[PDB]
Structures are given as structure tokens and as C-alpha cells.
Amino acid sequence: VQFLAXX
Amino acid sequence: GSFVEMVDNLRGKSGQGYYVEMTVGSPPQTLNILVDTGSSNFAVGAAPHPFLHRYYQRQLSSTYRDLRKGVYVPYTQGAWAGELGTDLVSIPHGPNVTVRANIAAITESDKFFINGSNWEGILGLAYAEIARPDDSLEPFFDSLVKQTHVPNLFSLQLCGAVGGSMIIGGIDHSLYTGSLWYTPIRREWYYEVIIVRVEINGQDLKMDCKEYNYDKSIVDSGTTNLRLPKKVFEAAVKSIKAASSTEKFPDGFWLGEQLVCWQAGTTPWNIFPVISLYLMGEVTNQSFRITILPQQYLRPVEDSQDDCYKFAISQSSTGTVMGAVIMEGFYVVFDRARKRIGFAVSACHVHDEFRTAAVEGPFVTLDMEDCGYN
């Protein structure tokens, strides 16, 4: 899995 | 120990994250929730989806309060859109409390839910700075700490091949061996830390430490791999290849594009090197190191009499991500109250009769303050 893009 | 009822409260499938049961609304609706220290939104599927066995039904919850606001969260991979509200939330194998928390009801999604993962939502455990829509949406753990007596600390034991423990409000000493070593949380957004040195089989990778943390290094239970900045990845692979030269593998293996399989139970762990990350310590010029085995960075793929593996160190353009590859070696204490993260050798980590994961110190490392990106 690959969890936050951005932040 | 006193936290015994929280032990073994995590489940999962390899490479698909770890989840905990959370009970939402009234009457109770229990759902499986992926534990993600790399984001800050609590969100649950709230409409049917081919990959969901169950979902949050807001109309059935008497305590649901609509916030009349949409919310959208994109991840490195995957995204979802939903609707904000608050409701009662308990963790039945967690702390003995009930809080009113923000919840994003996921109504549409893209490449988020995973066929057969058994989870239906995500628990973002990082800080408000990175919450969507903005930092005014209080994350779950913030609500827990503000509304209750529960100490501002949780800890994670992720046991790979899946299960593990999320201890909430403290630490359970059965979950590790040896000593806990702490590294500072550099800034409260992601769980950001500073890597000061990298070794492969004891050999210094010899890159400027600023490279290791460009543009950040984070601890992220919601990411499977150890992800490394491009320049660091390239150097690491070259060194790992050199250390494992008794066997050759295709280029695509090191790129995670090709799998290699061995007859069941014959995987030559011994030919692959150990990898150490040194982390900034709590005292000036003092560091410690964590060391993982190929059992951590070579991941079994699901899944005959053949054990297939994917190389789970990969390239990043957003800094270092210490995902399950790192975390499965260790009991990891997210000591928010003292703004530090602790590591100790995990009592459940996968190893062999020859090598074990390790957490060792102290070492002397100068100018560690300069390693961080500004």
C-alpha cells in the first residue's frame, strides 16, 4: 500500500 | 501487563496494510480500519463498493452529525472523496473510552480500497497540519487526547509474514526486547525524523546526510516499502547488489518490477545484506542505529511450493518513507507527549538462527542538525 500526497 | 487487552489487536494481509477494529455511531457499527501514521484523516467507506464487505450507514446512526462539508484526500497512490460529519467512536480492543470524532464518509474512490484486504476505512494518526480540508479538522488522536484521560502516546508492533499490536496510551513491555532508543520528532506534521547515516552490511553508503532527508524523512505505517530519494535509492541498490554478488538478479528485480521465487523454505537469506539507518538521538552529537534484515525488505507476494519475493525498497520524489519494511523490525513508540519516536527490537519480527534485527547505540555523529531539509 502507499498512504498522504500534498500535506 | 496492564495493556494486555490491546495486544494482538491488529490484523492484515502482507503488503495491504494493518487494520484495527473501530466501532462507530449508535447503535454500534464496527469496521476494520487501516492504521496510517502517514496521514491525518479518519475516513470510512460509507456506500457500497465492489471491494467492501461492509460500510458506514449514517442514516442508521442516531448520533451522526452532518458537517455539511465535502472532503477529498489524495494519497501517493489512491484517492477518495466524501462528506464530513462527527459521530461517536470507540476502539473495542483499544482504550476504554468513547469520543466524538470527525469522520469522513467515503462516497467515491479511486484505487483506494483493495480487493480482499478486509479493511473499510483509514485512521490517519499524524498531526493536524496535514489534515484535509485543512488543519482545523481535528484528527482522531487529537480528539482522543483532548476529550479523555488517555496519555498522548501510542505504539505499534507490526508483525510481518499478518498481525500486531496498537497500544494506546502507553507501552507494553512484552512487545520488545532490549532497550528503547528515541529520535526526536523534528516537526509535528508527518512523523518527521532525521537519518544521519546509512550502512549496508556495516559499510557506510557515504552520502551527504542531507541527501537522506531531502525533502523529509517520515515514519509511515500506511506505506509498505522503504522508499528512498532517487540519489539514495540508486546508491543503496548498487551497494546491496555488491553485497549480494554471490547470486545475480535481473535489473527489474531491484526495481520492484520482477519477482524472484525459491522452493518453499529455501530462501538464501544469508546472501543478502543487513541495512542500518542511524537516527538522531536525544543528546547532542549522539545517534543510534536500527538494522533490518532481508526478511524485512524482501516481501512475500500472495502467494504452491514456491516462495516469491518482491524487493521492497523503492524510489521516492518526496523524501524517505520508513514504511512497513522498517516498522516490521521494531516496536515503534509514537511518544507525542515528548515529541519523540522510540525504537526497540520487536518480539515478533521475522528473523533466522543467524541474524536478528537490532537497535543499538549510542554512536557519535557530529553536525546532525545540518542533515535536515529547510
Domain boundaries, chain B: 18-150, 151-374
What distance in Å separates the CA atoms of residue B67 and residue B102, rounded to the nearest whole number?
9
Q: Do B36 and A3 touch (CB under 8 A)?
A: yes
In the residue annotation, B220 being an active-site residue is answered as yes
Half-sphere exposure of B289 (CA within 13 A, CB side): 20
Give B234→chain A minimum CA distance, Å. 20
Catalytic residue among B87, B142, B172, B220: B220
Give the B window 128-167 contacts with A, CB below 8 Å: 129-130, 132
Q: Do B126 and A1 touch (CB under 8 A)?
A: no
Residues 6+ apart with CB under 8 A from B134: none
- Does B36 touch chain A if contact means CB atoms closer than 8 Å? yes
Residues of A in contact with B122 (CB under 8 A): 3
> Do B18-150 and B151-374 show the same overall fold?
yes
**% helix / strand / coil in chain A, to the nearest 5?**
0, 30, 70
User: Mapping DSSP to helix (H, G, I), strand (E, B) and coil, where does residue B269 land?
Assistant: helix
Q: Which residue has the cell 478486509?
A: B118
Q: Do B76 and A5 touch (CB under 8 A)?
A: yes
Give A6→chain B minimum CA distance, Å. 8
Q: Do A3 and B74 touch (CB under 8 A)?
A: no
Nearest to B107 by CA among B51, B55, B168: B55
User: Mapping DSSP to helix (H, G, I), strand (E, B) and coil, where does residue B272 land?
Assistant: coil
Residues of A in contact with B221 (CB under 8 A): 3
**CB-CB contact of B39 with B130 (8 Å):** yes
Q: Which CATH class is domain B151-374?
A: mainly beta
What distance in Å separates the CA atoms of residue B374 and residue B362, rounded to the nearest whole number?
26
Q: Which residue has the cell 442508521?
A: B60
- Does B316 touch chain A if contact means CB atoms closer than 8 Å? no
User: Mapping DSSP to helix (H, G, I), strand (E, B) and coil, where does residue B283 land?
Assistant: coil
10 Å CB burial of residue B125 (0-12, 13-18, 19+) is: buried
- The verdict on whether omega for the bond into residue B27 sits within 30 degrees of 0, i.e. cis, is yes
Catalytic residue among B8, B36, B135, B367: B36
What distance in Å separates the CA atoms of residue B123 and residue B22, rounded to the nearest whole number?
9
- The verdict on whether omega for the bond into residue B303 sits within 30 degrees of 0, i.e. cis, is yes
Nearest to B14 by CA among B321, B361, B307, B360: B307
Q: Which residue has the cell 526486547?
A: B177
DSSP-derived secondary structure letter, B371 = G
Half-sphere exposure of B263 (CA within 13 A, CB side): 1
Q: Do B190 and A4 touch (CB under 8 A)?
A: yes
Q: Do B16 and A7 touch (CB under 8 A)?
A: no
Domain spanning B18-150: CATH 2.40.70.10: yes
Give B37→chain A minimum CA distance, Å. 9
CB pairs A-B closer than 8 Å: 52
Rg (CA), chain B: 20
Do the strands B313-316 and B226-229 form a parallel or antiparallel pair, or are they unpaired?
parallel
- The verdict on whether omega for the bond into residue B362 sits within 30 degrees of 0, i.e. cis, is yes
Q: Do B75 and A7 touch (CB under 8 A)?
A: no
**CB-CB contact of B172 with B347 (8 Å):** no
10 Å CB burial of residue B232 (0-12, 13-18, 19+) is: buried
Residue B366, φ and ψ in degrees, nearest 5: -95, 155
- Does B221 touch chain A if contact means CB atoms closer than 8 Å? yes
Amino acid in position B70: G
